């Protein structure tokens, strides 16, 4: 139950090509190779609906030009950028966005597990579509006009999830009880209820009274069913650590104890992570 | 869109019920109060098909007896045990579970979180159905080990799944490329690929203006799509810490920076946690 993935790769190196061919040697991946910019532009413009992922080597000649023409034509597809630019640093993972904002950056020696990275590129495009691109946006603010073919990136995104997706049952959480939806008052109210629960964990950590599984699972349930971002949990930790940093700096104790509570934050996030992971409906 | 959860609360205290009624003040929750053990046992038979979730206070007299009897009638529903009142004479704790394995344990002052905890109590039941009770699923009918051959818990699980659950679309990862499904050779090449990737992260973790975040993404991508448990990530961290540990003893200082490398673990797990959180759809 897996749909084929049509991959168009722009590579002008006999070394990288083989690295990609060996990594994507599976039957699932339909490899199309273009060994020049003109060939890429030629294939893309006449196979726009037949490219699921692009593998672009950033060091390619006229790279900015080709990508820009691809971009203006509306050929904005999931992409993995390999290596860096030829102006003028050596070969390492790219630093700035070269195609669009959902692209992936890989070094020339990170192509071994390329199948997993192709999944990441596809998934990230679906998440961010329609994706901000780095050309047709144009640019320094030298715009001109049309077009607005926004359907293109959406037609592709929906088409891909109708091919790279599956249906599973999930517990209907209350979105109205999510943290980001509660009114400003109730928002900080639940924030304190979680701050109290997390403090219950930090203290019971290293005891152990205690039943640390219960105290942590109590906190993780709130973070999960309220769709609380991981950034909030860390925020709660440092807020509490800020308070404890004060305590020790008054009872003449060392802040060296704060290092050991990094384990607490590891423990809770790990639990939260498995909560989301377990809830993923798997069909195997 | 949201189904109504029917709550059956067994409470003797005036203060405990007063909090439960306050927390579940929303009209979504059908509250049915029983201010004695005999009221619960009788309501259990008359309305066995009308109970979505239980809230059993341990501080209630003849607790285990009411629980023991409750499993006899076949009443196996999501539960939330509140407070601590361990019996002194049953001499068969245990305490791995009072009612069933998927039961929830809360504090007497942790009741303003009940809506989220009710969600957790229901979701946990669906995930572990059918569960095990310390009253029927071990004895007596009929070795082994339950009087529900057609799965009376699943007849309820299916009933709760359709009302408290929805249907969404996920990116279908290849289960044949999960770490625990890959061939032995394939499995440990990916494992080495992740070890290498993680080392790259650690070595450049305190290097500003680097591909650190791009290095994290590429590790987390491998971690997410190979469905590796967070423990393996924690394990990968150790294998490198052990390496650095011995490396530091001679030809180096003490192992204090390893404590600074706890930030690296928090950092990576946080990314992985968000990626799972982001991969959850809506009903549409």
């Amino acid at each position: 139950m897996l749909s084929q993935i049509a991959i168009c790769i722009w590579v002008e190196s006999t070394a990288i090509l083989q690295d990609c061919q060996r990594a994507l040697s599976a039957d699932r991946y339909q490899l199309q190779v273009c060994e020049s910019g003109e060939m890429l532009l030629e294939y893309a413009q006449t196979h726009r609906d037949q490219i699921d992922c692009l593998i672009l080597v950033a060091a390619n000649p006229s790279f900015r030009a080709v990508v820009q023409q691809l971009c203006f034509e509306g050929v904005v597809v999931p992409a993995i950028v390999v290596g860096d630019r030829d102006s003028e640093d050596p070969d390492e993972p790219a630093k700035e966005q070269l195609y669009h904002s959902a692209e992936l950056h890989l070094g020339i020696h990170q192509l071994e597990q390329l199948p997993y990275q192709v999944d990441a590129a596809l998934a990230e495009f679906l998440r961010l579509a329609p994706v901000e691109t780095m050309a047709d946006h144009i640019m320094l603010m030298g715009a001109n006009h049309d077009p607005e073919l926004s359907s293109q990136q959406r037609d592709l995104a929906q088409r891909l999830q109708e091919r790279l997706g599956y249906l599973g049952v999930y517990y209907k959480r209350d979105p109205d009880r999510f943290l980001r939806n509660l009114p400003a008052y109730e928002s900080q109210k639940l924030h304190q209820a979680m701050q109290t629960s997390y403090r219950e964990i930090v203290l019971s950590y290293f005891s152990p009274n205690s039943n640390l599984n219960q105290s942590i699972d109590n906190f993780v349930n709130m973070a999960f069913f309220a769709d609380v971002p991981v950034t909030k949990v860390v925020e709660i930790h440092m807020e509490l650590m800020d308070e404890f940093a004060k305590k020790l700096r008054v009872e003449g104790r060392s802040e060296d104890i704060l290092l050991d509570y990094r384990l607490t934050l590891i423990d809770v996030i790990a639990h939260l992570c498995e909560m989301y992971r377990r809830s993923i409906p798997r069909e195997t | 869109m949201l189904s109504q959860i029917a709550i059956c609360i067994w409470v003797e205290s005036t203060a405990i019920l007063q909090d439960c009624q306050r927390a579940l003040s929303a009209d979504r929750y059908q509250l049915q109060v029983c201010e004695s053990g005999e009221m619960l046992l009788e309501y259990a038979q008359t309305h066995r098909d009308q109970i979505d979730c239980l809230i059993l206070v341990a501080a209630n007299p003849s607790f285990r007896a009411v629980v023991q009897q409750l499993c006899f009638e076949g009443v196996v529903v999501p539960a939330i045990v509140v407070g601590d009142r361990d019996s002194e004479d049953p001499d068969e704790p245990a305490k791995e579970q009072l009612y069933h394995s998927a039961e929830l344990h809360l504090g007497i002052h942790q009741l303003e979180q009940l809506p989220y905890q009710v969600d957790a109590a229901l979701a946990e039941f669906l995930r572990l159905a059918p569960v095990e009770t310390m009253a029927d699923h071990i004895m007596l009918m009929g070795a082994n080990h339950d009087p529900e051959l057609s799965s009376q818990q699943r007849d309820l699980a299916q009933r709760l799944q359709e009302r408290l659950g929805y249907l969404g679309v996920y990116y279908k990862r290849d289960p044949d490329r999960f770490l625990r499904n890959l061939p032995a050779y394939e499995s440990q090449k990916l494992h080495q690929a992740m070890q290498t990737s993680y080392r790259e992260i650690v070595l450049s973790y305190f290097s500003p203006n680097s591909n650190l975040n791009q290095s994290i993404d590429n590790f987390v991508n491998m971690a997410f799509f190979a469905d590796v448990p967070v423990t393996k990530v924690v394990e990968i961290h150790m294998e490198l810490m052990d390496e650095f540990a011995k490396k530091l003893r001679v030809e180096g200082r003490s192992e204090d920076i390893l404590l600074d490398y706890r930030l690296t673990l928090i950092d990576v797990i946080a990314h992985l946690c968000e990626m799972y959180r982001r991969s959850i759809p809506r009903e549409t």
Binding site: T231, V234, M238, A245, E255 | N213, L263, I266, A270, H271
Partner: peptide, 16 residues
């Protein structure tokens, strides 16, 4: 304060 600076490192990075 110091770890608050170090914790904010992990905060802003996964935003991203």
């Amino acid at each position: 304060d110091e770890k608050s600076e170090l914790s904010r490192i992990v905060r802003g990075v996964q935003e991203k």
